[model samples]
Target: YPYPKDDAELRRRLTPMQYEVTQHAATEPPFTGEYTDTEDAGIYHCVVCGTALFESGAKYHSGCGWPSYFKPIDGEVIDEKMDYTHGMTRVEVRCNQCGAHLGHVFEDGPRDKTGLRYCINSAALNFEAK
Candidate 1:
């Protein structure tokens, strides 16, 4: 009853935009995600499979039109692949547990930190407050 391997169950569960972004690799509009400017103390989990993703402390403001994190909760919990889907090469990050599309990772993050920006979608996450 987890992992949401069924498309019908997913469509019935998540909103159309959430479903689109997670399953079809679409993205939420810039600066419009729910978690874009959040400063809560919580752990972000995969909306599809409920796998823990980013902890609150790792979150930061990159102002890159999405929620940004310096790193995932673990290296392998998120998967990256070279994406050339829209005529530009990008590193797409996904939830390794359920193969849900979370967002992209960029090198343009806080220099003092990991120098990485894990740009994620709010629709792709379900935050569990600490």
Candidate 2:
């Protein structure tokens, strides 16, 4: 009902980077993501579960080396947790449906908007044109 439950199917459905980033909490190289520079009308979904996570309307240029969004389509679709990795405290965002690691959230964003940045890995998302 949600996504592939079998480990084999999950592996088959995701690419190397997608599997690594989503399943293993790994991050891809910055400025190398498929959607980092994209400016299109669409929704970004979880690569593993196809659950809608973000809207193109909320996307913005954060200049922080990743695709940024001011807010998610729904706050309930994500799970935020404290991340003490990388020698610093950060908020890690993961898909609620599948527990797939999307990326981190930061406070340094457009104050005119949410003033929060949802710094996401493109490898963890799949864009669907609206």
Candidate 3:
């Protein structure tokens, strides 16, 4: 929960790309992350706070970079913010408990349910298979 004791330790603990996205907010290219096509039963959690965010069953292919989850495990784990960058308006997602930058949320999703696309950063999450 508290910041890792040292930046070097964190760097040593995480892969270079994980460090980039979790510590630097860098987005991994589409379909390239380890989780992009992973369908193993698991829970996706905030890498920073270890808070459970999304369930494996909620994951889907959104044809976008990063892992896409249709919904969160609960409302309290996520907070939405207004993002108006790149001349487009969107909702940004962040870890509710620690305020870590998670990713953006869009509305173009499956027509059946919430229809909200949670275009999240893979580095922002750590998966624990059930």
Q: Pick the candidate with the highest TM-score.
A: 1
Which lDDT tens digits does candidate 1 get at residues 49-124? Answer: 9899999999997878888999899987998988999889999999999999999999998899899999999999
* Alpha-carbon deviation at 80 in model 3, angstroms: 1.1
Off by over 4 Å in 3: 1-12
TM-score of each: 0.95, 0.95, 0.84
Cα deviation at 60, candidate 2, in Å, is: 0.4
Kindly indicate the candidate among 1 and 3 with the higher TM-score.
Answer: 1
Rank the models by TM-score, top first. Answer: 1, 2, 3
Report the C-alpha lDDT of model 2 over 61-110, residue by residue, as the tens digit: 88877899999998799899999998999999999888899999999988
Q: Considering summed lDDT, which 10 consecutive residues are worst modelled in model 3?
A: 1-10
Q: Higher-TM-score candidate among 1 and 2?
A: 1
Which of candidates 1 and 3 reaches a greater lDDT? 1
Residue clash pairs of candidate 1: none
> What lDDT does each candidate get?
0.91, 0.91, 0.82
lDDT over C-alpha atoms for residue 69 of model 1: 98
Candidate 1 wrongly placed segments (more than 4 Å): 1-4
True lDDT of residue 97, candidate 1: 90
